[PDB]
């Protein structure tokens, strides 16, 4: 379970960062050979990635990084609206902490400065995850893990990264600017039009 957890993390991080592309096959012998772990170690890591909703087993073809359908994307936006709007709308200026929201934005700004378009989508997910965490539930947090996973894959299937991300990064600052002014209600409306924009835009271009 610990050689496993660590093999699964290497693989998961490569899917997050787009090194394994949506649709790419994960080869058990190539992996086992390169990492020097056993087949079981690699098969258990695949199980973990399957539950994370990053990869899917094909019958006699092996394991492939997922490509989320239009329906998967609508399902993800319902989850994000529910949980991020709650986190924003329920935020308590007089007590809540915005530092991780702010760190995700500093990080996005940095990726953008270096033209790392992929890293900018990644940081956009950290920011929206930070807003879901404003709910202060570990449970909401563990559960949204596979939503953020799949939200990343959708961004890789897009391959429109440069043009897609910058106008959402600017709107992220505006959401964060309103929360930090203590205007959670305005923040929350800004975020709802955002999620709705983002969905309709991804669907408009989708496959």
C-alpha positions as CSV (number, residue, x, y, z in Angstrom):
1,X,0.0,0.0,0.0
2,X,2.9,2.5,0.3
3,X,5.1,1.6,-2.7
4,X,1.6,1.6,-4.3
5,X,0.5,5.1,-3.0
6,X,3.7,6.5,-4.3
7,X,3.6,4.8,-7.7
8,X,0.0,6.1,-8.0
9,X,1.1,9.6,-7.1
10,X,3.8,9.7,-9.9
11,X,1.2,8.5,-12.3
12,X,-1.6,10.8,-11.1
13,X,0.8,13.8,-11.3
14,X,1.7,12.9,-14.8
15,X,-1.9,12.9,-15.8
16,X,-2.6,16.2,-14.0
17,X,0.3,17.9,-15.7
18,X,-0.6,16.6,-19.1
19,X,2.4,14.4,-19.6
20,X,0.0,11.5,-20.2
21,X,-2.5,12.9,-22.6
22,X,-6.4,12.1,-22.4
23,X,-6.8,8.9,-24.2
24,X,-3.1,7.8,-23.8
25,X,-2.5,4.1,-22.7
26,X,-0.6,3.4,-19.5
27,X,1.7,0.5,-20.1
28,X,2.2,-1.9,-17.3
29,X,5.5,-3.5,-18.5
30,X,7.0,0.0,-19.5
31,X,6.1,1.4,-16.2
32,X,7.2,-1.6,-14.1
33,X,10.5,-1.7,-16.1
34,X,11.3,2.0,-15.6
35,X,10.2,2.2,-12.0
36,X,11.4,-1.3,-10.9
37,X,8.3,-2.3,-9.0
38,X,6.2,-5.4,-9.3
39,X,3.2,-5.8,-11.5
40,X,0.9,-5.9,-8.6
41,X,2.3,-2.6,-7.4
42,X,1.4,-1.1,-10.9
43,X,-2.0,-2.8,-11.0
44,X,-3.0,-1.5,-7.6
45,X,-1.9,2.1,-8.7
46,X,-4.2,1.7,-11.7
47,X,-7.0,0.8,-9.3
48,X,-6.5,4.0,-7.4
49,X,-6.5,6.0,-10.7
50,X,-9.6,4.3,-11.7
51,X,-11.4,5.3,-8.5
52,X,-9.9,8.9,-8.9
53,X,-11.7,8.9,-12.3
54,X,-8.4,9.7,-14.2
55,X,-8.1,6.3,-16.2
56,X,-10.5,3.6,-17.4
57,X,-9.9,-0.1,-18.0
58,X,-10.7,-1.2,-21.6
59,X,-11.7,-4.9,-21.9
60,X,-8.7,-6.5,-23.5
61,X,-6.8,-3.2,-24.4
62,X,-5.4,-2.1,-21.0
63,X,-5.8,1.2,-19.2
64,X,-6.2,4.6,-20.8
65,X,-6.4,8.1,-19.4
66,X,-10.1,9.2,-19.5
67,X,-11.7,11.4,-22.0
68,X,-14.7,13.1,-20.2
69,X,-18.0,13.3,-22.2
70,X,-20.2,16.5,-22.5
71,X,-22.4,14.8,-19.8
72,X,-19.4,14.4,-17.5
73,X,-18.6,18.1,-17.9
74,X,-22.2,19.2,-17.1
75,X,-22.0,16.9,-14.0
76,X,-18.8,18.5,-12.9
77,X,-20.2,22.1,-13.2
78,X,-23.3,21.2,-11.1
79,X,-20.9,19.9,-8.4
80,X,-18.7,23.0,-8.6
81,X,-21.6,25.4,-8.5
82,X,-23.0,23.7,-5.4
83,X,-19.9,23.4,-3.4
84,X,-17.9,26.6,-4.5
85,X,-20.9,28.9,-4.3
86,X,-21.6,27.6,-0.9
87,X,-18.0,28.2,0.1
88,X,-18.1,31.8,-1.2
89,X,-21.6,32.7,0.0
90,X,-20.9,31.3,3.5
91,X,-17.6,32.9,3.8
92,X,-17.1,35.0,7.1
93,X,-14.7,37.9,6.6
94,X,-14.5,38.5,10.4
95,X,-12.8,35.1,10.8
96,X,-12.3,33.2,7.5
97,X,-8.9,32.9,5.9
98,X,-8.3,33.8,2.2
99,X,-4.6,33.0,2.0
100,X,-4.9,29.8,0.0
101,X,-7.3,31.5,-2.5
102,X,-4.6,34.2,-2.8
103,X,-1.7,31.7,-3.1
104,X,-3.5,30.0,-6.0
105,X,-3.8,33.3,-7.8
106,X,-0.1,34.3,-7.2
107,X,0.7,30.9,-8.7
108,X,-1.5,31.4,-11.8
109,X,-0.1,34.8,-12.4
110,X,3.4,33.3,-12.3
111,X,2.5,30.5,-14.9
112,X,0.8,33.1,-17.1
113,X,4.1,35.4,-16.9
114,X,6.1,32.3,-18.2
115,X,3.5,31.4,-20.8
116,X,2.9,28.0,-19.2
117,X,-0.7,27.8,-20.5
118,X,-1.2,24.3,-19.1
119,X,0.2,25.4,-15.7
120,X,-2.3,28.3,-15.7
121,X,-5.3,25.8,-16.1
122,X,-3.8,23.7,-13.3
123,X,-3.6,26.9,-11.0
124,X,-7.1,27.8,-12.0
125,X,-8.2,24.3,-10.5
126,X,-6.2,25.1,-7.3
127,X,-8.0,28.4,-7.0
128,X,-11.5,26.9,-7.5
129,X,-10.5,24.1,-5.0
130,X,-9.4,26.8,-2.5
131,X,-12.9,28.3,-2.9
132,X,-14.6,24.9,-2.2
133,X,-12.3,24.7,1.0
134,X,-13.9,27.8,2.3
135,X,-16.7,25.5,3.4
136,X,-14.2,24.2,6.0
137,X,-15.2,20.6,5.7
138,X,-12.5,17.9,5.3
139,X,-15.2,15.8,4.1
140,X,-16.3,18.2,1.2
141,X,-12.6,18.4,0.4
142,X,-11.9,14.6,0.1
143,X,-15.1,14.2,-1.9
144,X,-14.4,17.0,-4.4
145,X,-10.9,15.3,-5.2
146,X,-12.3,13.5,-8.2
147,X,-14.2,16.4,-9.4
148,X,-10.9,18.6,-9.6
149,X,-9.2,15.6,-11.3
150,X,-11.8,15.3,-13.9
151,X,-12.0,19.2,-14.3
152,X,-8.2,19.0,-15.2
153,X,-8.7,16.3,-17.7
154,X,-11.4,18.3,-19.4
155,X,-8.9,21.2,-19.7
156,X,-6.4,18.9,-21.5
157,X,-8.9,17.5,-23.9
158,X,-9.5,21.1,-24.8
159,X,-6.1,22.0,-26.1
160,X,-7.1,25.7,-26.3
161,X,-5.3,26.6,-23.2
162,X,-3.7,29.9,-24.0
163,X,-6.8,31.4,-25.4
164,X,-9.1,29.7,-22.9
165,X,-7.5,30.6,-19.6
166,X,-6.5,34.2,-19.6
167,X,-9.9,35.7,-19.5
168,X,-11.0,33.3,-16.6
169,X,-7.8,34.2,-14.7
170,X,-8.8,37.8,-14.9
171,X,-12.3,36.9,-13.7
172,X,-10.7,34.8,-10.8
173,X,-9.0,38.0,-9.6
174,X,-12.2,39.9,-9.7
175,X,-13.9,37.1,-7.6
176,X,-11.0,37.2,-5.1
177,X,-11.1,41.1,-5.1
178,X,-14.7,41.0,-4.1
179,X,-14.2,38.3,-1.4
180,X,-11.3,40.2,0.2
181,X,-13.5,43.4,0.3
182,X,-15.9,41.3,2.3
183,X,-18.5,41.3,-0.5
184,X,-19.4,37.6,-0.5
185,X,-22.7,38.2,-2.1
186,X,-21.3,40.0,-5.1
187,X,-18.3,37.4,-5.1
188,X,-20.9,34.6,-5.2
189,X,-22.9,36.1,-8.1
190,X,-19.6,36.7,-10.1
191,X,-18.7,33.0,-9.5
192,X,-22.1,31.6,-10.7
193,X,-22.1,33.6,-14.0
194,X,-18.4,32.4,-14.3
195,X,-19.2,28.7,-13.9
196,X,-22.0,29.0,-16.2
197,X,-19.8,30.8,-18.8
198,X,-17.1,28.3,-18.5
199,X,-19.3,25.3,-19.0
200,X,-21.2,26.7,-22.1
201,X,-17.8,27.7,-23.5
202,X,-16.2,24.3,-23.1
203,X,-19.3,22.6,-24.4
204,X,-19.4,25.0,-27.5
205,X,-16.0,23.8,-28.5
206,X,-16.5,20.2,-27.3
207,X,-15.4,17.3,-29.7
